[PDB]
Amino acid sequence: SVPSQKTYQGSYGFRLGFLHSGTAKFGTCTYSPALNKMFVQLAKTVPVQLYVDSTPPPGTRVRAMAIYKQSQHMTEVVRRCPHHERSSDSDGLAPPQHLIRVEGNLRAEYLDDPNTFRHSVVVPYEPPEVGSDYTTIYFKFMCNSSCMGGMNRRPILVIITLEDSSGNLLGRDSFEVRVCACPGRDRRTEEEN
Numbered sequence: 617s618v619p620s621q622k623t624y625q626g627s628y629g630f631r632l633g634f635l636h637s638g639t640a641k642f643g644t645c646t647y648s649p650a651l652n653k654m655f656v657q658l659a660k661t662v663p664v665q666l667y668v669d670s671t672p673p674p675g676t677r678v679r680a681m682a683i684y685k686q687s688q689h690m691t692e693v694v695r696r697c698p699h700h701e702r703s704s705d706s707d708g709l710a711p712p713q714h715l716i717r718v719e720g721n722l723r724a725e726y727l728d729d730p731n732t733f734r735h736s737v738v739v740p741y742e743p744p745e746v747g748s749d750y751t752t753i754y755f756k757f758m759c760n761s762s763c764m765g766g767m768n769r770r771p772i773l774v775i776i777t778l779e780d781s782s783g784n785l786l787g788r789d790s791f792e793v794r795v796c797a798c799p800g801r802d803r804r805t806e807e808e809n
């Protein structure tokens with residue numbers, strides 16, 4: 617039951633943006649508009665902006681979930697590699713098995729789908745700060761794209777869904793991600809083609 621990656625702006629005109637780096641330090645991440653792909657370093661904070669034409673209702677939620685981009689790997693759950701999963705770096709908030717974490721949000725839910733077993737993280741939707749037209753969410757990717765036993769060099773797509781309090785779909789957008797040692801080098805290389 618591979619999750620959908622169909623872009624859907626929906627009633628609120630939901631879409632992502634990667635124009636503002638916020639507190640992310642230079643060299644830790646870079647986004648390629650041409651490839652709609654974010655390149656980031658292991659465990660470094662990466663800001664992603666949410667935009668809506670109209671503010672959604674109370675109880676609206678934002679979910680982030682990763683899936684493999686390639687057809688032959690889509691049915692496989694994206695998870696932490698064996699090596700990083702057994703590492704002791706977290707107390708008990710974000711499960712060691714989850715690739716994606718949200719940073720700086722006291723209301724993050726780390727979920728494991730009871731049927732598909734897929735991992736995702738959800739936070740309540742919050743409107744932009746006064747004076748801004750976007751909402752920033754900081755993510756952290758806990759494995760390198762090259763991690764053996766994990767992503768194992770396979771490209772992934774991060775799907776962001778806007779949902780109501782019951783889980784109904786309100787909007788969807790996505791972007792490819794590569795977790796690597798030098799985001800800029802890989803972005804330049806991939807843009808060559």
Ligand SMILES: [Zn+2]
Binds near residue numbers: 696698700766
């Ligand atoms: Zn790993």
